[PDB]
């Protein structure tokens, strides 16, 4: 959105941030995930871990990650500004996302977006005053088949309708985080109208095995 930082009292280099002891063990594991040199490869996972330990990325975190990696902070800034999953402004306990590309706009995802706006009393990219919900319209998410979908903190709620997102919000507004997946008779990418690709069992080891 902005792609520039101005020192707010909240977001400033003296804003308090540090990793818990377990987070440091996760960091050294992550750095063992990449060679002895070229340890800057851990910028993305370590920065997601920072986003995960505090919910978002203050500049203090974006500098402490450079300190932890011994990398210049500008590279961490470049990374965080490039990738969209890194929240540089604070967001809510539940970060709502809605796909609006053609495979899900062509199934009227905007109906879900309307019924999701009126339920929260917000515009698209706004937050709620209770700091419990935010909202954005985003691009594809890889479940285009179950087209009308949303995403609430690392899980998908798919092929849903206005009733089946009002239900979801009423559950999120009570401490009950509900079950993800298709909110219909389906549970996966299967065709709804009965099995069509396979109903027989799967064959066992050695089936069709080549001579060798």
């Amino acid at each position: 959105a902005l792609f520039v930082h101005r020192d707010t009292p909240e977001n400033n280099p003296d804003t308090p941030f540090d990793f818990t002891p377990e987070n440091y063990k996760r960091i050294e594991a992550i750095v063992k995930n990449y060679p002895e040199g070229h340890q800057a490869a851990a910028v993305l996972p370590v920065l997601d871990l920072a986003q995960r330990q505090n919910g978002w990325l203050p500049i203090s975190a974006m500098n402490k990650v450079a300190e932890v990696l011994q990398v210049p902070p500008m590279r961490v800034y470049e990374v965080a500004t490039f990738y969209t999953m890194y929240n540089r402004k604070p967001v809510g306990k539940y970060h709502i996302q809605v796909c609006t590309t053609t495979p899900c706009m062509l199934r009227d995802s905007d109906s879900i977006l309307e019924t999701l706006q009126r339920k929260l009393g917000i515009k698209v990219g706004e937050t709620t005053p209770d700091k419990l919900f935010t909202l954005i319209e985003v691009e594809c998410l890889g479940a285009c088949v179950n087209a009308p979908m949303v995403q609430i903190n690392d899980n998908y709620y798919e092929d849903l309708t206005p009733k089946d997102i009002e239900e979801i919000i009423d559950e999120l507004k009570a401490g009950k985080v509900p079950k993800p997946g298709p909110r219909s008779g389906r549970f996966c990418c299967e065709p709804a109208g009965g099995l069509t690709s396979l109903t027989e069992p799967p064959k066992g080891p050695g089936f069709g095995v080549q001579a060798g």
Partner: protein
């Protein structure tokens, strides 16, 4: 059977599943190479 869904484990995953798993896996993995250098600086 092929009459119900059986990947229901991911209804019980927290924020720190992936990284705890990598922390477990770091023991299994080999010592990695080196560029004869601690960093490109």
């Amino acid at each position: 059977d092929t009459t119900t869904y059986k990947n229901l484990q991911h209804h019980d995953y927290n924020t720190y599943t992936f990284l705890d798993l990598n922390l477990d896996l770091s023991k299994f993995r080999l010592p990695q190479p080196s560029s004869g250098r601690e960093s490109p600086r």
